[PDB]
Design a protein around this ligand. Structure first.
Ligand SMILES: O=[N+]([O-])c1ccc2c(ccn2[C@H]2C[C@H](O)[C@@H](COP(=O)(O)OP(=O)(O)OP(=O)(O)O)O2)c1
Ligand SMILES: [Mg+2]
Ligand SMILES: [Mg+2]
Ligand SMILES: [Mg+2]
Ligand SMILES: [Mg+2]
Ligand code: NA
Length: 533
DNA sequence: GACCACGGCGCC
DNA sequence: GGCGCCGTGGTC
């Protein structure tokens, strides 16, 4: 790309671009270039130059596509060396790291970024050649998904701003009641948001027993777990837990979200990061819309602020127990497979032992938590029960589901020999510490390693389903808005919502037939909370 | 102003 | 197990 040639570039060229800020819905496009065949082409006027491209091909392609969609241009993302690198090794998460590893330097200049995209793609493509399964994942899942995500990002989701504003004032008044009570009990005001100040008050001034210490600096912890244990030692504790809940939700959702509404769309626009996790899941940021509250009453009130466009409805679809079903398929356990083929339910079953949607959620931490290496001592204090018999409550699980333990053992042994583990579709995660000589490190690694094929296969299935579903939705005049790992949120014209729900449900359930059926629960509503029933 | 480590905590 | 964001106490 050494030789400068006039804009525009020939087709197939790789693009480089510089944004005033990371978020493509908010960014000014500062510069735009393209590189091909020993030539680099710099655009004199980036916005207008955008009209010359047939597709965004290069590093961070989806970001340029989103910005183009923002500007009303149907420019899809194409090849992206980040996706190749991320499939080769999902620790490849940044252009900085990928450049250093595969043969260049990530700079702040568009031409250089275009030249770099071209060279990295050449080096990665060949590496990803011969890896037929990763190649299939690239062509059939990741590359097409990037176009789907680009449209989700540019579309956004409507937020009831007036509602959240009123909710803010109400929550502020309750926070004031809580602070005032805490200060009376402490005998003096202090910064209740400072865990250092709180630690002194609880443990030095009120003489409460310390329970645990913090990881890096060894302070006496004031975490929810510690406070819960101290709930009956002093009236101040309950008030602090309530304060923690309200301030967490006010500072993270109630106050920030209304300020993130885009002036042009009137909606909230998240970023779905495609090379961000060790397992093949997506992440969401700026804002994060994959962690909107749902558990507590105030949380639920916040979830109600997410609403459909006037005259449309939200459709929410959630895979049922997807990780357990995946485990059944991967392990081949007959008992577990039978549980699903018959129609039994695992989450609800542990719930009654320990049933509405509230007490069923708590079961999720249990069944799942125990499944992924949770120590009995953990389950003990997490279930509020005697540490006995063993274990015990965790035991026998492997007895009734024997093939699961065997799958775990085989997964680890293979991970030790090859240095990585894989999903059903061959997505890999390298786990070098499986051979660490320090037990705590090695066992932490083991839990990461055997988790990945389960979490990652579930992620693979959801991505493939999004790729299958997206074009059907366009045809029906419906929109895909959000993904939350095992859930999708769509928006449909009211008259069509029912037909969309039915279709979307079939597509997600039939995505890839397993030894067990995939089941999908679906709700329709004017807001996110009511759409999940 | 920007950025950092940490503890803490929201969701799957 | 997997994420990203917040306020505090802090540096530059
Ligand atoms: O270790 N943990 O504590 C732990 C580990 C994994 C966990 C959770 C809580 C959820 N997951 C995983 C497992 C699932 O893939 C997804 C959660 O999905 P979900 O909340 O919709 O619960 P499902 O298991 O899918 O069942 P459900 O949708 O019918 O309630 O994320 C907790
Ligand atoms: Mg589910
Ligand atoms: Mg779910
Ligand atoms: Mg951290
Ligand atoms: Mg400060
Ligand atoms: Na290559």
């Amino acid at each position: 790309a050494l030789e400068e040639a006039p804009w525009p570039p020939p087709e197939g060229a790789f693009v480089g671009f510089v944004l005033s800020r990371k978020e493509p819905m908010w960014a000014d496009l500062l510069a735009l270039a393209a590189a091909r065949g020993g030539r680099v082409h710099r655009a004199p006027e980036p916005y207008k130059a955008l009209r010359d491209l047939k597709e965004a091909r290069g590093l961070l392609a989806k970001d340029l596509s989103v910005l183009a969609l923002r500007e009303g241009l149907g420019l899809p993302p194409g090849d992206d060396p980040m996706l190749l690198a991320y499939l080769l090794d999902p620790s490849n998460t940044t252009p900085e790291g990928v450049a250093r590893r595969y043969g260049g330097e990530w700079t702040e200049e568009a031409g250089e970024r275009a030249a770099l995209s071209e060279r990295l793609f050449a080096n990665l493509w060949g590496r990803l050649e011969g890896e037929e399964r990763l190649l299939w994942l690239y062509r059939e899942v990741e590359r097409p998904l990037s176009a789907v995500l680009a449209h989700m990002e540019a579309t956004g989701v409507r937020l009831d701003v007036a509602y959240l504003r009123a909710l803010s004032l109400e929550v502020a008044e309750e926070i004031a009641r809580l602070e005032a009570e805490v200060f009376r009990l402490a005998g003096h005001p202090f910064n209740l948001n400072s865990r250092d100040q709180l630690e002194r008050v609880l443990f030095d001034e009120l003489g409460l027993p310390a329970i645990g210490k913090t990881e890096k600096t060894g302070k006496r912890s004031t975490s929810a777990a510690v406070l819960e244990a101290l709930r009956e030692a002093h009236p101040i504790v309950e008030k602090i837990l309530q304060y923690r809940e309200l301030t967490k939700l006010k500072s993270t959702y109630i106050d920030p979200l209304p300020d993130l509404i885009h002036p042009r769309t009137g909606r909230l626009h998240t970023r779905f990061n495609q090379t961000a996790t060790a397992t093949g899941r997506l992440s969401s940021s700026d804002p994060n819309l994959q962690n909107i509250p749902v558990r507590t009453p105030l949380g639920q009130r916040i979830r109600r602020a997410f609403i459909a466009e006037e005259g449309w409805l939200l459709v929410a679809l959630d895979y049922s127990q997807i990780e357990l079903r995946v485990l059944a398929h991967l392990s081949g356990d007959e008992n577990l497979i039978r549980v699903f083929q018959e129609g039994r339910d695992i989450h609800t079953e542990t719930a009654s032992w320990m049933v509405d949607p509230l007490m069923r959620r708590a079961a999720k931490t249990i069944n799942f938590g125990v499944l992924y290496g949770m120590s009995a001592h953990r389950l003990s204090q997490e279930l509020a029960i005697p540490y006995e018999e063993a274990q015990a409550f965790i035991e026998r699980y492997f007895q009734s589901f024997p093939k699961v333990r065997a799958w775990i053992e085989k997964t680890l042994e293979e991970g030790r020999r090859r240095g990585y583990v894989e999903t059903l579709f061959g997505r890999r995660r390298y786990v070098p510490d499986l051979e660490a000589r320090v037990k705590s490190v090695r066992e932490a690694a083991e839990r990461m390693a055997f988790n990945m094929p389960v979490q990652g296969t579930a992620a693979d299935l959801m991505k493939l389903a999004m790729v299958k579903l997206f074009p059907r939705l366009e045809e029906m005049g419906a929109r895909m808005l959000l993904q939350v790992h095992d859930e999708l949120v769509l928006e449909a014209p009211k008259e069509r919502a029912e037909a969309v729900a039915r279709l979307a449900k079939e597509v997600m359930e039939g995505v890839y037939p397993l030894a067990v059926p995939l089941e999908v629960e679906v709700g329709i509503g004017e807001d996110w909370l009511s759409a999940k029933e």
